[PDB]
């Protein structure tokens, strides 16, 4: 089975500040790997797939980049919506994992 | 308008089973794979498995062997995840969520199953 080490579990972060996922396959996954976000008290939703797709409405500054077992989600400049849970999935054979997240917090 | 409700909130016993179910519209489930995603209290999403309710096809994660039974009832767009053994392990949202390899774009908004002290 494949799974996802997702760095870091925790990110602490300013409006405005880049900052920059990653998550490492222990197998190659032929960059079927998607990222999801999830707001605090909602569902998850798909904001990036096929490593560096875009999905519905998601705006320029996330970019997903990497290849066979290496990937990476920046947000460039982050808002005020953006703050939330991040999780990336992989999607080559099944079981079909989920990285341990990365929860990205405003500094108060 | 694609839709996934889900059940109601599950307060249960140790050792217990319970029958999570959820009801898709807006598209017919026969044309995608249906999946179950755990999130323990303050924790991160599991993918428990999924099923393919146009042949009846099941996978799961091997740690959910036995814990999990994923069905589907094509008749009324529903599938549901069959619970066994109840433990504290298992209080979680349990997510029903639509998709395939280009991700999942479409989720319930989750049943909390809350099990009670002692398993």
């Known amino acids: 089975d494949i799974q996802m080490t997702q760095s870091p579990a925790k990110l602490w972060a300013s409006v405005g500040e880049t900052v920059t996922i990653t998550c490492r396959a222990s197998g190659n996954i032929h960059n079927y790997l998607a990222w999801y976000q999830q707001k605090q008290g909602k569902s998850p939703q798909l904001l990036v797939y096929n490593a560096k797709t875009l999905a519905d409405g998601v705006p320029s500054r996330f970019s997903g980049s990497g290849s066979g077992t290496q990937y990476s989600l920046k947000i460039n400049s982050l808002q005020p919506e953006d703050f939330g849970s991040y999780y990336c999935?992989?999607?080559?054979?099944?079981?079909?994992?989920f990285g341990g997240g990365t929860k990205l917090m405003i500094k108060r | 308008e694609v839709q996934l409700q889900q059940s109601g909130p599950e307060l249960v016993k140790p050792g217990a089973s319970v029958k999570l179910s959820c009801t898709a519209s807006?598209?017919?489930?026969?044309?995608?794979?249906m999946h179950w995603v755990k999130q323990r209290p303050e924790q991160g999403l599991e993918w428990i498995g999924r099923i393919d309710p146009a042949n009846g096809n099941t996978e799961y994660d091997p740690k959910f062997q036995g814990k999990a039974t994923i069905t589907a009832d094509t008749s009324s767009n529903t599938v549901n995840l069959q619970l066994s053994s109840l433990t504290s392990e298992d209080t979680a949202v349990y997510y029903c969520?639509?998709?395939?390899?280009?991700?999942?774009?479409?989720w319930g908004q989750g049943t909390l199953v809350t099990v009670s002290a002692g398993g």
């Open positions: 807006g598209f017919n489930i026969k044309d995608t794979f």
């Open positions: 999935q992989h999607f080559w054979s099944t079981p079909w994992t």
């Open positions: 969520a639509s998709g395939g390899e280009l991700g999942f774009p479409y």
